[PDB]
Design a binder for this molecule. Structure first.
Ligand SMILES: [Zn+2]
Lengths: 100, 129, 150, 185, 81
């Protein structure tokens, strides 16, 4: 039924290339390197809107994590909270072509 | 959980012998079981027996002839000096003139008479008659 | 019987009396292993990998044809996880139940089953810490346990 | 000289005859030589059969057993044809290490491939080589004796239905233990 | 009973017994050689499948999993080997 997004990300985090945080996302997105961005639920709406605008300019995919930054940190295997993720190389994963 | 495969085997054998059956299936197998059955076979208490080789541990099928009264098991496997087999035999055998206690030694598994002849001792396993 | 219940069920796999076979397989241990590593790179466990190769790739089990076990192969190729799947999945289970408990304090059965799970974890951890595949302490702490399994 | 070359030891007349047979097979050549150049044997043991015939035991190093095992059919067919009055079979020289005693002692412990029972079982498995064994049973007879029944599969048993007694004698001569074969129906 | 050959039981009693409680345990399952009507590639398929197995091309369906025996898809060519 549902192959979890968390399980997908754990493959990207061990196989692929990611960056965390708004500043590094925006940097990579100015560079056009980013394919997907994942955005927490508790992120401020202005930040979310700003990212959406950068993404519709870069023709980049956007996933809305059904979860806040604390859970998203845990999902990507980190002891801190993270509000936005940028995927720049998926490795052995499938997230680009998946239902996302 | 099983603790003594030998105990399970000999309870099964005794129960079948009580019922008058002429064959038993025993699982799992072991070298010690084989040695026990070889002893009983040599002293005539059982017939042939066949070791099936599953790749797990084994089963055994024994062809029986009657004449058996009780096969039993001593758990714990006590430590036995050579002086005490007489006391044991008096305690857990019907008579002096028949029945055999089997024990495990560094010289090997054998009956208490053979252990007397070799002047050795070891550990007690069970009894047959 | 069952560890933490009265269950007496016995459903399991009946391996055949054979250490080869199929005759009909006829591919290679090596190409099979290539497939193995590929699906390992996909980040699957030996369990579902062997299930896959059963259902699809004509495979009985690599134990037969390779002369090795799956986890051995992954270790040899550097694909081994830090931990085993046993603890992995048990910890997922514990964590899920813990999250459920956070928002349902009153569910007693979840609480009960949780300590069952954690006792399983601790005993199994004693085993793996005995065989030294782990660091000697490692002390699963349910609080930090989330980002460990994740 | 691919004659004394291809064993890999000097003696003897039997193995040399065998090597020249190898050579005539290599001269076939095409689909034969291609896989027969790497395949060398070590020793031979000719022994009696209860009937009239004799029985050839061809010993092997066992990194070569694969190619030998790839064929088995044809090398045995041609050798049975040429060296007649015989039952040919291939075998692997497996080293048996003893179980260490308290006196006897050795490091590099003792893997289970090199133990005695495993070596004997595999020697048997190569004696049959086709027809994967599908059953072993061991009767312990009241005269303190033991005999092993080996239950074979019906597939490809036509090639070896006439070698059973010779195989029995072979296992008895090498291992010292009795043997019988069986086909389920 | 009280006398019988436990080594040579009947095939009927051994086929009706549980797989583990036979004299020698072993699988009652098997493998199938399968080609769908569309393509002509062969697929090796386990009888009791845990996955929705696909053939090499066309990405459609060969057999759908169930609790026990796999449910093969619509009419296809399937052997037992
Ligand atoms: Zn398809």
């Amino acid at each position: 039924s549902q192959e979890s997004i968390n399980q997908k990300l754990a493959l990207v985090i061990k196989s692929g290339k990611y960056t965390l945080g708004y500043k590094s996302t925006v940097k990579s997105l100015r560079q056009g390197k980013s394919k997907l961005i994942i955005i927490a639920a508790n992120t401020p709406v202005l930040r979310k809107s700003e990212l959406e605008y950068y993404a519709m300019l870069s023709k980049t995919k956007v996933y809305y994590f059904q979860g806040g930054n604390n859970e998203l940190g845990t999902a990507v295997g980190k002891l801190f909270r993270v509000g936005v993720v940028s995927i720049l190389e998926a490795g052995d994963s499938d997230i680009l072509t998946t239902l996302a | 959980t099983r603790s003594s495969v030998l105990a399970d085997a000999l309870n099964a054998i005794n129960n079948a012998e009580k019922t008058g059956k002429r064959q038993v299936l025993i699982r799992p197998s072991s070298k010690v079981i084989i040695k026990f059955l070889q002893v009983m076979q040599k002293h005539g208490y059982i017939g042939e027996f066949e070791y099936i080789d599953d790749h797990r541990s084994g089963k055994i099928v024994v062809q029986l002839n009657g004449r058996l009264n009780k096969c039993g098991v001593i758990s714990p496997r006590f430590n036995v000096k050579i002086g005490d087999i007489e006391k044991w035999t008096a305690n857990l055998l019907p008579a002096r003139q028949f029945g055999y206690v089997i024990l495990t030694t560094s010289a090997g598994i054998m009956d208490h008479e053979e252990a007397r002849r070799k002047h050795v001792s070891g550990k007690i396993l069970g009894f047959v008659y | 019987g069952r560890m933490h219940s009265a269950g007496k069920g016995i459903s399991s796999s009946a391996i055949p009396y054979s250490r080869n076979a199929p005759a009909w397989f006829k591919l290679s241990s090596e190409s099979v292993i290539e497939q193995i590593v590929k699906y390992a790179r996909k980040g699957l466990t030996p369990s579902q990998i062997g299930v896959l190769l059963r259902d699809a790739h004509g495979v009985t089990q690599a134990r037969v044809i390779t002369g090795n076990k799956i986890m051995r192969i992954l270790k040899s190729n550097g694909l081994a996880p830090e931990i085993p799947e046993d603890l992995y999945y048990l910890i997922k289970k514990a964590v899920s139940v813990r999250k459920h408990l956070e928002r349902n304090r009153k569910d007693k059965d979840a609480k009960f089953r949780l300590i069952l799970i954690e006792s399983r974890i601790h005993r199994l951890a004693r085993y793996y810490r005995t065989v030294a595949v782990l660091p000697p302490n490692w002390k699963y702490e349910s609080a930090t346990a989330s980002a460990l399994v994740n | 000289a691919p004659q004394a070359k291809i064993l890999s030891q000097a003696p003897t007349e039997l193995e040399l005859q065998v090597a020249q047979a190898f050579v005539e097979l290599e001269n076939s050549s095409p689909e034969l030589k291609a896989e027969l150049r790497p395949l060398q044997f070590k020793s031979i043991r000719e022994i009696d059969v209860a009937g009239g015939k004799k029985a050839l035991a061809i010993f092997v190093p066992v990194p070569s057993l694969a190619g030998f095992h790839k064929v088995q059919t044809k090398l045995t067919r041609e050798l049975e044809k040429k060296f007649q009055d015989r039952h040919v079979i291939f075998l692997a020289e497996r080293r048996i290490l003893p179980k260490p005693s308290r006196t006897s002692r050795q490091v590099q412990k003792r893997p289970r491939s090199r133990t005695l029972t495993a070596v004997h079982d595999k020697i048997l498995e190569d004696l049959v080589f086709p027809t994967e064994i599908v059953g072993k049973r061991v009767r312990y007879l009241v005269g303190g004796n033991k005999i092993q029944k080996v239950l074979l599969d019906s597939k490809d048993v036509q090639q070896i239905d006439y070698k059973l007694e010779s195989f029995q004698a072979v296992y008895n001569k090498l291992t010292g233990k009795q043997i019988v074969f069986e086909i389920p129906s | 009973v009280l006398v019988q050959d436990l080594l040579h039981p009947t095939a009927a009693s051994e086929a009706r017994k549980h797989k583990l409680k036979t004299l020698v345990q072993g699988p009652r399952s098997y493998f199938l050689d399968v080609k769908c009507p569309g393509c002509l590639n062969i697929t090796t398929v386990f009888s009791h499948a845990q996955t929705a197995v696909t053939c090499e091309s066309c990405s459609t369906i060969l057999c759908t999993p169930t609790g026990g025996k796999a449910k093969l898809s619509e009419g296809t060519s399937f052997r037992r080997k």
